[PDB]
C-alpha cells in the first residue's frame, strides 16, 4: 500500500528532475558575463524612526510611498510618515506578541497578527476619531505568521499549522483553505497582478498557489534549511527566497528550477527578509549579522553593505516608486536608507 | 501656504499627544516583568497556573508581588514545532520551565525534558535569557520509589554510581534514596547548564509540590536574583 505509493512518488520526482535537467541548457551567470557591473553602491540613513519600546518584528509600506505601518512587541502598532517623521496614528493592540502587519492599498485598513492565531483588522476612517478593532478573524490553529492584503475585501493569511487561507472580511469566514505544506509556512509574497502568490514553508519547499483555483501549481525544493521570507520579481515571472543556510536563491516559474544562488563564505548567518528593488537589478537582503547586503540580481555580487543596525535586521521593505528602503531591526530603530 | 502649515500644526499636535501616551506606556512597560512559562504536557503546568492565579493560542496571567507587576505567558494551543516562535521570547525577563518526574509512562519523558532544556540553553538568541527550573511531582517520586524497582537506574547507569552531595541538606521525614533521585535529576540539569559556561545566564533549581502556595514568592526571589546578577554583570563587577 504505502510502499508502492511512495515508489510511484519517487518515480514521479525522478520524472520531474529529468524535466528539470533537460530544461537546464545553460546558466544565467554565463549569460550575464558581458554585462556592465553595478559597482559600489552607497546608501545613507536619511531618517531614523524612534519611540519604539520593544523589538520591531514586521513592517509594510503604503502604495503612495508615504505612510508606513510598523509592528512592535510592546503592543503598539504605529502608522508613521516617512517624510516628516510624524506618527500619524498609534494603535494599541490586545495581544502584546505580534508577528506581522499589513497595510491596505487604499489605506483604509491595517491588519495585525501574532501568536494568538487571530488576525485583527483595524479601520482608519475614524468618524468618532478613535481607532477601533474592525474585525477579528479566528480560524487558524497554528500561530499567524505573515498576512497580506489583496484588496479591502479579501485578506490572505499564513497560519502556523501548515495551512494558508483566503479570508473574506465581510462574511468573516474562510473562502478557500489549503494545507499542501508539510512544514511551517513562514511568509507569503503576493503578485502585482494578484492572481498567484508564493509561500515559503520550513520544509525547504516554495509553493506557487492559485488564489482563484485554490491549489498549488509548482513546487520548488532547492534549499537546504528553513525558507524565512519570499519576494516576487516586479514582472511576476520570478521570485527570490532567503533561508537559514546563508544562501539566497532565485527561482523561475517557467523554468521550474533555480536560476541563481547567492552565497558568500565569510557570512554564515541567516537571512531574515528579502525585498527586490523597483527595477529588479538590486536584490536587497536582511542578514542576521546586523547589516543589509545589496546583491546584484544578475551578477551575484555584493554592491554594498548597510551596517547601520545595532541588532539583527528583522525585516526589510521597499517603496513602490523605488525611492527609499526601510529596515526594521530589533534595537527599536527603523532606518530609512536612500541611495 | 496657510493650510499647509496648519496641517503641519495638526500633525504636530497629534504627534505630541501620541508621544505623551507613548511616554506613559513606556513607564507602564518598564514597570512590567515578563515570564515565559514552558512545560511538557505530562507536567502539571495547568496545576501551576491554577496555583499562580490563587481556545486562543497564548494565555496570559497578570499578578503583582510587592507592587511589582508580572505577566506570565502560557503557551497553549500551539504546534509541537517550537523553534520559529521561540525567537519572540528573548525580550522577556525570565523563562520558567516545569518538568514532571515519574519513577514508578509510555516513553522516557525525562530525557525529552533534558533535550528541550539543552536546546533552550545552547540557542543563540536564548543565551541572554535566564531559565528558572521547577521539578514537579516530588511527592509522587517519594510514593513511587517504594515499588520494588527503580525506573531511573534502568534509564541511567550513572545513578548506581552516585552519592548524595554533602553541601545539600535534605528535608526531614525523607528517604535518602528518594533524595538521591531528586539531587541526581537536579545534577543532570545543572551539568547541562554548567556545560556551556557562558556566565551570562544561570539555572535556578526548585523542588516543588503538587499543591503548594509558596511558588509565587520563589519566582519573586529568583527575579530579584536575576536582576541583581544583571546589574553585577552590567557594572563589570563579576
Amino acid at each position, epitope marked *: 500500500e504505502l510502499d508502492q505509493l511512495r515508489q510511484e512518488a519517487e518515480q514521479l520526482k525522478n520524472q520531474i528532475r529529468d524535466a528539470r535537467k533537460a530544461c537546464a541548457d545553460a546558466t544565467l551567470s554565463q549569460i550575464t558575463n558581458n554585462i556592465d557591473p553595478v559597482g559600489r553602491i552607497q546608501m545613507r540613513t536619511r531618517r531614523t524612526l524612534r519611540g519604539h519600546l520593544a523589538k520591531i518584528y514586521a513592517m509594510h509600506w503604503g502604495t503612495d510611498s508615504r505612510l508606513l505601518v510598523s509592528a512592535s512587541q510592546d503592543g503598539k502598532l504605529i502608522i508613521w510618515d516617512s517624510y516628516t517623521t510624524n506618527k500619524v496614528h498609534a494603535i494599541p493592540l490586545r495581544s502584546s506578541w505580534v508577528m506581522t502587519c499589513a497595510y491596505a492599498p487604499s489605506g483604509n485598513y491595517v491588519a495585525c497578527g501574532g501568536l494568538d492565531n487571530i488576525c485583527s483588522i483595524y479601520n482608519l476612517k475614524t468618524r468618532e476619531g478613535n481607532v477601533r478593532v474592525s474585525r477579528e478573524l479566528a480560524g487558524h490553529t497554528g500561530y499567524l505568521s505573515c498576512c497580506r492584503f489583496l484588496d479591502d475585501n479579501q485578506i490572505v493569511t499564513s497560519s502556523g499549522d501548515t495551512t494558508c487561507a483566503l479570508w473574506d472580511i465581510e462574511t468573516g469566514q474562510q473562502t478557500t483553505t489549503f494545507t499542501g505544506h508539510t512544514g511551517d509556512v513562514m511568509s507569503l509574497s503576493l503578485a502585482p497582478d494578484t492572481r498567484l502568490f508564493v509561500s515559503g514553508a520550513c520544509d525547504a519547499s516554495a509553493k506557487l498557489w492559485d488564489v482563484r483555483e485554490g491549489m498549488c501549481r509548482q513546487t520548488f525544493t532547492g534549499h537546504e534549511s528553513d525558507i524565512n521570507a519570499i519576494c516576487f520579481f516586479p514582472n511576476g515571472n520570478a521570485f527570490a527566497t532567503g533561508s537559514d543556510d546563508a544562501t539566497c536563491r532565485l527561482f523561475d516559474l517557467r523554468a521550474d528550477q533555480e536560476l541563481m544562488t547567492y552565497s558568500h563564505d565569510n557570512i554564515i548567518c541567516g537571512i531574515t527578509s528579502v525585498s527586490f528593488s523597483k527595477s529588479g537589478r538590486l536584490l536587497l537582503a536582511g542578514y542576521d549579522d546586523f547589516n543589509c547586503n545589496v546583491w546584484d540580481a544578475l551578477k551575484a555580487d555584493r554592491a554594498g553593505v548597510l551596517a547601520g543596525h545595532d541588532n539583527r535586521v528583522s525585516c526589510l521593505g521597499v517603496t513602490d516608486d523605488g525611492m527609499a528602503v526601510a529596515t526594521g531591526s530589533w534595537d527599536s530603530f527603523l532606518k530609512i536608507w536612500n541611495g | 501656504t496657510e493650510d499647509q502649515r496648519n496641517e503641519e500644526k495638526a500633525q504636530r499636535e497629534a504627534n505630541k499627544k501620541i508621544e505623551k501616551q507613548l511616554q506613559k506606556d513606556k513607564q507602564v512597560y518598564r514597570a512590567t516583568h515578563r515570564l515565559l512559562l514552558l512545560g511538557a504536557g505530562e507536567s502539571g503546568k495547568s496545576t501551576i497556573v491554577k496555583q499562580m492565579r490563587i481556545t486562543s493560542g497564548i494565555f496570559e496571567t497578570k499578578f503583582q508581588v510587592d507592587k511589582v507587576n508580572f505577566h506570565m505567558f502560557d503557551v497553549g494551543a500551539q504546534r509541537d*514545532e517550537r523553534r520559529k516562535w521561540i525567537q519572540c521570547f528573548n525580550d522577556v525577563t525570565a523563562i520558567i520551565f516545569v518538568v514532571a518526574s515519574s519513577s514508578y509512562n509510555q*516513553t522516557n519523558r525525562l530525557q525529552e525534558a533534558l533535550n528541550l532544556f539543552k536546546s533552550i540553553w545552547n540557542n*543563540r538568541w536564548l543565551r541572554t535569557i535566564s531559565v528558572i527550573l521547577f521539578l514537579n511531582k516530588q511527592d509522587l517520586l517519594a510514593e513511587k520509589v517504594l515499588a520494588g524497582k527503580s525506573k531511573i537506574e534502568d534509564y541511567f547507569p*550513572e545513578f548506581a554510581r552516585y552519592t548524595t552531595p554533602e553541601d545539600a541538606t535534605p528535608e526531614p521525614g525523607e528517604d535518602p534514596r528518594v533524595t538521591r533521585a531528586k539531587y541526581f535529576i537536579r545534577d543532570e540539569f545543572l551539568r547541562i547548564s554548567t556545560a556551556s559556561g557562558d556566565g551570562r545566564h544561570y539555572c535556578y533549581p526548585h523542588f516543588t509540590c503538587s499543591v503548594d502556595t509558596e511558588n509565587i514568592r520563589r519566582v519573586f526571589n529568583d527575579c530579584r536574583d536575576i536582576i541583581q546578577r544583571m546589574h553585577l554583570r552590567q557594572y563589570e563587577l563579576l
Partner: nanobody
Amino acid sequence: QVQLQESGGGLVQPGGSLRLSCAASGFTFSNYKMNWVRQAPGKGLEWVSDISQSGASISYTGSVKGRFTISRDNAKNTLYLQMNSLKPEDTAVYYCARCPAPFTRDCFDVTSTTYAYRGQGTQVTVSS
C-alpha cells in the same frame, strides 16, 4: 532537495550486531549537527543520540549508553550506527535526522507531526 536514506535493519537476534546507514543527499554534510531518533510501537519518538559538525562531541541516552557507535564520514557522506548486545525490550523503527540550522548546537527534531528533515526510517525487530 534535503533527502535522507536509511539502510540496514530487519529481523535480528538478541546479542547480535547490526549496522545502520544513513545516506545524506541534497545538502552540505559538514555544516549540520546530525542525530539518530527511534520510535517504539504504540509509543513516541525518543532521542537515541547526536553528533556535531566536526564529530568531536558525542552524547547518548543513558538506558542504551555505551552500546552504540556513531561514525559520520564527511568524505563518504554517510552516517553509520554500530549496534551490539541487542536487547528484546528495544525493538523499534529507526530514523536518521538532521538539525535544521547550520553552525549551531541546538536541535528541535522531536516532533512526530510530520517533521520534514528526517528520512523514511528502517524497521528493526528483535525476536528472542
